[PDB]
């Protein structure tokens, strides 16, 4: 006897306990009033008229089930469901040197975004009348590594300022991608504590004036809001969070990250730490390849990208077969048969690392490496359609995603990789010029072999089904217009088209002449 909590620790340097009233609890009351386990009034020994006692907020340890109230922490599974709800959170801190001692206050709040908010040490302090949120003196933590936090003590900024700054920076980053938040953090504890300041909590509610569920809360006037229609909202109404380290990693976060990702260096700036927590959580779930059981609602613009993907695939590789008349085509990165051009005399060979159980006999099991495999595929042509690899074979038709370009679809990853999401999000390697060294960049063209049938648009680049004339032939002139439109959409979503050096538009004309 007896058990005590780090939570609400009284960090004051006051040597006396508290008068039985104005004392928060029987644990607090001073020895002088306590007898037989009871606490007792002594008019003789006076209550403090004026006192300031810092209350530690640490080890908030909140696990509770209320039917109306939603869990703040979410399952590893449920965190996968919502990604880029994902924001890394690690807060550097400071301790109180002077008026009181023993607890920790937020100094620099880091995020998966480059963003870094700093605050003036502020803590909860008890007086006779009320508990009062106020500034405090504080010191940098002791270590030599922590010497860099010294200047940050002075810098800024009021907390009523910061919590609005956080909500806006969170509002604009998350608005299009998700309806909610999840914080990915390494040490569950401290940043839960940092959350006291901006965060509020409660049973789910709907955005005010808006349609969807509410992200934010404004104290100024009782209201609720979402990422979208909400400013001047200083609070976060129902955030979610998950602890990566809670997944059983052996070491410290820096070690675990550094294996998978050599792109994120170390500056002890709080953002770096919170980047690394996403950068590593991504890898853990999403470097495990392309789980198809998950389902991600799309907004948006993606569906059109989806179809335009197939349309540009079909046409390019068709033409590519006409032009250069390859004996065989090696399709790599095809879990299922699915010939992009259904009908060609060409011998079509399938390869992927993981074949589908159905269509397993059609496909050969292979992981492509240029080091091993440049020798073997010499004959015919090779096709990689969103099969992302180290440097590509000389004779090739490939579509690769460029991580560098930005859309609401794709999110950062390890290392330099981006994780692209429409459905079934595939994490992909970083766009690298070195892999396209043998191939050349694929100029736009449009090819149809057809009979022909508001204003005419004539295009030098296309093989018009009929080039005798202008020749704007209302069937092709319209069909070209449509394809170039859905082509310019696929390249806008940042896909790249690469072909063998040998390919030439001209060799297509010879299929026309007859």
């Amino acid at each position: 006897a007896e058990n005590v909590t780090g939570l609400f620790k009284d960090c004051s340097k006051i040597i006396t306990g508290l008068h039985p009233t104005q004392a928060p609890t029987h644990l607090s009351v001073d020895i002088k009033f306590k007898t037989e386990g009871l606490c007792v009034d002594i008019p003789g020994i006076p209550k403090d008229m004026t006192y300031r006692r810092l209350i530690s907020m640490m080890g908030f340890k909140m696990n509770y089930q209320v039917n109306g109230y939603p869990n703040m922490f979410i399952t590893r599974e449920e965190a996968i469901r919502h990604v880029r709800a994902w924001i890394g959170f690690d807060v550097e801190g400071c301790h109180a040197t002077r008026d009181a001692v023993g607890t920790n206050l937020p100094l620099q709040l880091g995020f998966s975004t480059g963003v870094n908010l700093v605050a003036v040490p502020t803590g909860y302090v008890d007086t006779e009348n009320n508990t009062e949120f106020t500034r405090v003196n504080a010191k940098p933590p002791p270590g030599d590594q922590f010497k860099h936090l010294i200047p940050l003590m002075y810098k800024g900024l009021p907390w009523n300022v910061v919590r609005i700054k956080i909500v806006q920076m969170l509002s604009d980053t998350l608005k299009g991608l998700s309806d909610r938040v999840v914080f990915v953090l390494w040490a569950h504890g401290f940043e839960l504590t940092s959350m006291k300041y901006f965060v509020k909590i409660g049973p789910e509610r709907t955005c005010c004036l808006c349609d969807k569920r509410a992200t934010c809360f404004s104290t100024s006037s009782d209201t609720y809001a979402c990422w979208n229609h909400s400013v001047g909202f200083d609070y976060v109404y129902n955030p979610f969070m998950i602890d990566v380290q809670q997944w059983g990693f052996t070491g410290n976060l820096q070690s675990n990250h550094d294996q998978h990702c050599q792109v994120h260096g170390n500056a002890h700036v709080a953002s770096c730490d919170a980047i690394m927590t996403r950068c590593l959580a991504v890898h853990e779930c999403f470097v495990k390849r392309v789980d198809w059981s998950v389902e991600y609602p799309i907004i948006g613009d993606e569906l059109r990208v989806n179809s335009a993907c197939r349309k540009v695939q079909h046409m390019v590789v068709k033409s590519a077969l006409l032009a250069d008349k390859f004996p065989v085509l090696h399709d790599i990165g095809n879990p299922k048969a699915i010939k992009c051009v259904p009908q060609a005399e060409v011998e079509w060979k399938f390869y992927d690392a993981q074949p589908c159980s159905d269509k397993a006999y059609k496909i050969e099991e292979l992981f492509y490496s240029y080091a091993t495999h440049h020798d073997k595929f010499t004959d015919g042509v090779c096709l990689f359609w969103n099969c992302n690899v180290d440097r590509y074979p000389a004779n090739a038709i490939v579509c690769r995603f460029d991580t560098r370009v930005l859309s609401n679809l794709n999110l950062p990853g390890c290392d330099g990789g981006s994780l692209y999401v429409n459905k079934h999000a595939f994490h992909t390697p970083a766009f690298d010029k070195s892999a396209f060294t043998n191939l050349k960049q694929l100029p736009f063209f449009y090819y149809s072999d057809s009979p022909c049938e508001y204003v005419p648009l004539k295009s030098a680049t296309c093989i018009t089904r009929c080039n005798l004339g202008g020749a704007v032939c209302r069937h092709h002139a319209n069909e070209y217009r449509q394809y170039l439109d859905a082509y310019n959409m696929m390249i806008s979503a940042g896909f790249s088209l690469w072909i063998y050096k040998q390919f030439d538009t001209y060799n297509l004309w010879n299929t026309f002449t007859r």
């Binding site: 909590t5 029987h26 644990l27 509770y64 039917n67």
Partner: protein, 133 residues
């Protein structure tokens, strides 16, 4: 790293943190009671004569043989959770005074403080009760 003074015991950890974070600290607690959660403990308990004024607000503890006596700044939820007070600016009623509760309902004196409000007529608990009405 304590190096500090412990004000609280584990059994209350969950509840207080919940009520702390809530936009509605009142409802939050109330619901929690419903959830099969334990009510607040460790609030300050008086050794009394059990004779005195029945009144709920007292400057020095006054208990009926039925009622029991509490420090009460412990039984004020907003004091106990170190969060702002229902009164707009900014002060608390139960800090600097004592509060009595019927012995049966003194299992959860914290809610009892929220649930009921004392009348300005007899300055005593309403319904537990009043000569008025």
């Amino acid at each position: 790293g304590s190096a500090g003074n412990a004000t609280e015991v584990p059994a209350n950890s969950t509840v207080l943190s919940f009520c702390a974070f809530a936009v509605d600290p009142a409802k939050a607690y109330k619901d929690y009671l419903a959830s099969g959660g334990q009510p607040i403990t460790n609030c300050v308990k008086m050794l009394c004569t059990h004779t005195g004024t029945g009144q709920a607000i007292t400057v020095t503890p006054e208990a009926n043989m039925d009622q029991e006596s509490f420090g009460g700044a412990s039984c004020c939820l907003y004091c106990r959770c170190h969060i702002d007070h229902p009164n707009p600016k900014g002060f608390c009623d139960l800090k600097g005074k004592y509060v009595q509760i019927p012995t049966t309902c003194a299992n959860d004196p914290v809610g009892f403080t929220l649930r009921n409000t004392v009348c300005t007529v007899c300055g005593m608990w309403k319904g537990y009760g009043c000569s008025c009405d």
